[PDB]
Symmetry: D2
Subunit: 314 residues, 4 copies
Amino acid sequence: AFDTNIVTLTRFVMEQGRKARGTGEMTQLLNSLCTAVKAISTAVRKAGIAKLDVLSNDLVINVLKSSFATCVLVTEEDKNAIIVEPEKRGKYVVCFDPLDGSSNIDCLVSIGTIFGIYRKNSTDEPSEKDALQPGRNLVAAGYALYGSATMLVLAMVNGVNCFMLDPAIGEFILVDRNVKIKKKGSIYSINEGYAKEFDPAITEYIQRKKFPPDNSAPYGARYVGSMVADVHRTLVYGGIFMYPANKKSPKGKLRLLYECNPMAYVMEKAGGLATTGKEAVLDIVPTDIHQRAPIILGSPEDVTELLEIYQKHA
Amino acid sequence: FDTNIVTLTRFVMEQGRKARGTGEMTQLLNSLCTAVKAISTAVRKAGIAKLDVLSNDLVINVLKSSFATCVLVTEEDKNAIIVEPEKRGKYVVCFDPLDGSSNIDCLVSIGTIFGIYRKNSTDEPSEKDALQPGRNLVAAGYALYGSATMLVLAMVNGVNCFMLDPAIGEFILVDRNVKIKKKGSIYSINEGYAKEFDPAITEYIQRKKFPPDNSAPYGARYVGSMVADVHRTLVYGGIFMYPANKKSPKGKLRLLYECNPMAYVMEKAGGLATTGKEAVLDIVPTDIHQRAPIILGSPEDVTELLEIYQKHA
Amino acid sequence: FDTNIVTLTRFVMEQGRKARGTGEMTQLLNSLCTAVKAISTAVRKAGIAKLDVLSNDLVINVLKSSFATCVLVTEEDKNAIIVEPEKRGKYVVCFDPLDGSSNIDCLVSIGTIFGIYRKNSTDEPSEKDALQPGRNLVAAGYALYGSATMLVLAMVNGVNCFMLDPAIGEFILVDRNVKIKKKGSIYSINEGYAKEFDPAITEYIQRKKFPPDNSAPYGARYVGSMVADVHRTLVYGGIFMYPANKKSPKGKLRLLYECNPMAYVMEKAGGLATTGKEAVLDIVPTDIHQRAPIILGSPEDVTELLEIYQKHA
Amino acid sequence: AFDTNIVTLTRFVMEQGRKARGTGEMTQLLNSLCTAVKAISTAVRKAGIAKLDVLSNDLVINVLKSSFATCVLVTEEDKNAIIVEPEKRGKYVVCFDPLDGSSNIDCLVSIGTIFGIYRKNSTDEPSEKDALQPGRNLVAAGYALYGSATMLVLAMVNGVNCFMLDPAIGEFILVDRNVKIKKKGSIYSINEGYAKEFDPAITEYIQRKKFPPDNSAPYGARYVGSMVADVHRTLVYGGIFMYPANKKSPKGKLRLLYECNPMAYVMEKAGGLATTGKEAVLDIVPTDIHQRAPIILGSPEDVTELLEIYQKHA
Ligand SMILES: O=P(O)(O)OC[C@H]1O[C@](O)(CO)[C@@H](O)[C@@H]1O
Ligand SMILES: O=P(O)(O)OC[C@H]1O[C@](O)(CO)[C@@H](O)[C@@H]1O
Ligand SMILES: O=P(O)(O)OC[C@H]1O[C@](O)(CO)[C@@H](O)[C@@H]1O
Ligand SMILES: O=P(O)(O)OC[C@H]1O[C@](O)(CO)[C@@H](O)[C@@H]1O
Ligand SMILES: O=P(O)(O)OC[C@H]1O[C@](O)(CO)[C@@H](O)[C@@H]1O
Ligand SMILES: O=P(O)(O)OC[C@H]1O[C@](O)(CO)[C@@H](O)[C@@H]1O
């Protein structure tokens, strides 16, 4: 044991970013983010022995500004975009959900940090307009799951890679390289306590998973109620995850910039699909930083089956 | 930096003192905690570089070494393990060393479940000493390997929750005399089995989604890991169900080391635990690996479901 | 991933079983290990963001809570602590909770030293029960907080060394029945006290540097922390000295909780421990904070120095 | 607790290196080195539960080459300088002692990693000649002490800073900023088992510390027998550390490039002095990568007192 050739997230992003002639900024940005992720992981691991959304928020803003790689930051927590001080500005726009579903801590349900990184393209002064790009423009996106293990999943133009935090050295080690989702899965994930408010396409799809017409075995249902936990299971095991709109949350619950679009970019770089039920989530041009969206994502055939049922109903 | 920390060892030692006992339960839970920490560290790095097997070996070894056990029943072993005379003590332990190990690929929280009986007869230790009603467990609980490692322990005196402090390797008392909510707002079941359900489960699920008294509908959650789902049911209230579907008409979950521990914890917290026909804890087992249907959780929610079972007679 | 790990708790429990005892020594060293891990974590981050005090409070609390002690003697406390009747057990423990705490500024390895006696009288617990010859300790040792945390434990059966595995928070048996080398090649003393030495220490130091039989000279090492210097003397052999200099003419180090533990460990490993006039362990103490001169280490090296003390009469 | 504004070694070197318009290479180099330091720290912390000089060596070479910041590496272990593959070359020369005094592990004596970093100045092809610069040219030097805590001490042109590894997050936190050694100390550190072979200046100096002519209190002696442990005590507490030549190790024992010169640069940036007894260690132009040297270092007045005794004797 004592491996002499550790592949850390920093080393990985460097061996790619160097083959691309990049300015070192991305490595710094993500190395910073990793420091915040280990700090939150440790706090969550001791939380009952020991508001954490708020402390997590502050920590992520402070390591991102000190990376000297960012210029506009968008949080769930902060009402308006944070524009970084000129001395510390670099060229990226980061949109992040710092501690997704923090009420789930009480029940020890695995929660996560979700992030999306854009490059600032304009010549003008950093404003929140720099944050209003469609998901399609993301240069990197991902999440950190704080579970039985801490996994950082990073998607960049070349594919999805998983890194697991080795607790003894405080480093994310590359554990799965260029991940791809199954074509067709066997689990559907949706909160069925909203049955009453679902649209017809949704309702027909669930019945087809439970009562397969085709008289195969019905799908298994799974719903942790933590988006990072449910998307991680959908990525490694396959299947479909659905948070559509239901009358009483008419534009969906999840936020387009820092929950839906990071997950949709990961899904797509893994060979999966992500849609509202009408358009692809990554093509939506955002008009508000806290804009909400329906999302259905997962294995290509499963999503395509629900898209055909949506087509049928309009 | 807190100087009078209550650890699981201090806690169990002071309760045992009141029994005017031998010290054997404290030796036992002390050893079990060593195994729990080692499985926790293993799951935390399961990826960097099967586990159910090592977990099984580890729990058996630390328990044989405690000088507190005489019969051991594992999910992994066809027959009960009888402890060597020189290491025998008075307890029978039935445990599931790493429930739903397949779940580790997806980072789903899993855990160790255990039930401890006292051997009461004078003849040689055997499987029959483990074939007691769950109502006769002297202690039970589970360790959850999740974003934090938690050990929940129920004994005659209540349910207490201990969190592993990873900096000093000790389980610290963080929650005392846990009691479940009387009525919750979450139902937990694998609805992919919908065609396989019976009339009462099906009518109950339906009235959760479409509430007759025009109430708020229940939220649904189903992690797919018994320890995670039951832990949320304990701290948040609600109902968790794994009834008989026709592919598992006795139920899926095993009575001695999955259903009975969890049911003993639920009833100690003021919750209820039923098959839909009898109390889980009052079933008299005939095979150490027999399965049972389970419905457990907040009292009003489980009663409601029991009233749909009997309004269906 | 090793499934039958020998922890200090398993080790002490199986030896105690042979005594047909009460289980009290195991309760005691189990609690002391909880305190040792917490002091270890504290020293490892002493810088990020006094400690002798918290260390002292922590050792007293875990010991009062073990139900195994009745008198406690600390470096930090003017008088012996008598344990409350409801928590009293049979042992007297004298300990130094964080020896040479000033050394932490320089990252010098420091440690906890302890000696355990059995209270033998029938009258109420008092300081007099701690005023026994070191020869009558039933167990002694130290925990070194260094690049690794090590607990060295000596009891009637030998010296064993246990290393803290920081991933599972358990002390693992890594070295069994440690015996010192008969003759070593390192002498350890604070030579800045050179004018204060006596004739025999001065002639001995001189013959280490300029060996009369034209031998190899000894290496000198002096960490300035009793636990580090004595630990190197145990694993590597040699001699360690803190004789009386005229500013400390009784010696500096305290008999009950620094000299006697270390001397009991040395004699159990086959080493010797002297003041230069008597065996340290046979001194009958009159004050719980009295000091003594100490010279301990490999048998041939300590004898040689004893022959320069008597060739000086 | 849970501090939201953690100052890590990476953040520190970045906030300096950015004010200097540097290429990001130094941050990468030292971030790499920190990964190797945490890995060795953890191995040493479990060594008895569990050649490590050799494994440590390999790990340090592999993280340095992957930093894309180095071109020539010099180790105690390897006979000749390691020239890095063109794809991975950057501009620094690193000379390192990977696990100083590894025999001291058996006795749990604190040992360390020592490093010196030069910039390659030549226009020619990386060779070991790039490593043969006098200590005066070092752009950064330092050490990692694996003790009761792991401390990384880093000296750069601006001063000496201490960082302590926080074990829970795997990060070196800045704990002492712009450190300076005491002018005059009260401890002298030398292996006096060599008394017989010392030169007259040394011998006179030790007697003056034990039998102060001036009839003050004699100095205290301390000698751990681990250079990193003894230099760290000399830096924080003051005093003098001496490893001169004694007949049977006639050019000193310690190596000029990766033991003496990193320590001499730290001492001097802390306001201390480091000398052979004849010249300043940092002005010696090395001719062999494994060249040995006398070194006496510590508080300015203490070293100056021994230098005057050396002057007297020639
Ligand atoms: O209770 P609901 O409405 O099903 O919410 C679940 C969703 O809410 C969150 O907890 C926060 O958005 C997500 O992690 C998850 O996908
Ligand atoms: O020390 P003993 O003999 O094992 O007795 C402990 C008994 O006390 C309890 O801890 C509660 O009084 C029980 O769980 C157990 O049966
Ligand atoms: O996939 P299913 O059929 O819903 O079963 C999940 C159940 O099985 C297990 O994975 C193993 O018993 C449990 O942890 C869990 O409650
Ligand atoms: O369990 P008890 O009564 O405390 O006895 C333990 C005794 O056994 C030993 O561990 C060795 O036989 C002693 O150190 C101690 O006095
Ligand atoms: O500075 P001195 O006088 O050599 O004393 C060092 C001794 O004092 C202590 O620091 C405290 O007793 C010991 O650890 C050590 O052996
Ligand atoms: O035994 P000696 O000759 O005093 O050697 C001590 C020196 O050797 C080393 O162990 C290795 O060079 C150093 O850490 C230390 O300064």
